[PDB]
Design a protein around this ligand. Structure first.
Ligand SMILES: [Ca+2]
Ligand SMILES: [Ca+2]
Length: 160
């Protein structure tokens, strides 16, 4: 939708929008402003996105409700932006998992105040022992003294 399309544009820098167009145009000989739904996956992949086939199929079904077999550049930017958000969140969850495992030194599944202090101290920041204990306090939601992955994610993400 026109709304959605205006928000996809807002999300991206103008040079990036022109870089996307440059690739996109390359599959539009017609200089119609649209490409074949059959090429959608290729241009997304080229632009470093990775939709699943199921995802590709969902999208095509969503833009090709008239049967013309094409996707226009405005609709393509809405798809691109949806895929980038899904992807960036995914990396972020993956990396978080990795910071957890590392924090959990003894790999018992929990961070304790000794492991929380060690990793915070190691930063070079001047954290005092009551500053580490406050962080613990605030993040430990079931008050068992440690930080489990669930509580880790809430502490890191924030809001979370
Ligand atoms: Ca541990
Ligand atoms: Ca806890």
């Amino acid at each position: 939708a026109m709304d959605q399309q205006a928000e996809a544009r807002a999300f991206l820098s103008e040079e990036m929008i022109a870089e996307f167009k440059a690739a996109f145009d390359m599959f539009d000989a017609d200089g119609g402003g649209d490409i074949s739904t059959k090429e959608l996956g290729t241009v997304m992949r080229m632009l470093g996105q990775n939709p699943t086939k199921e995802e590709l199929d969902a999208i095509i079904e969503e833009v090709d409700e008239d049967g013309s077999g094409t996707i226009d550049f405005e609709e393509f930017l809405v798809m691109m932006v949806r895929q980038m958000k899904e992807d960036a969140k995914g990396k972020s969850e993956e990396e978080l998992a990795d910071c957890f495992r590392i924090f959990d030194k003894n790999a018992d599944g929990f961070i304790d105040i000794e492991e929380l202090g060690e990793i915070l101290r190691a930063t070079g920041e001047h954290v005092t022992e009551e500053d580490i204990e406050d962080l613990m306090k605030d993040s430990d939601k079931n008050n068992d003294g440690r930080i489990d992955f669930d509580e880790f994610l809430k502490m890191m993400e924030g809001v979370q």
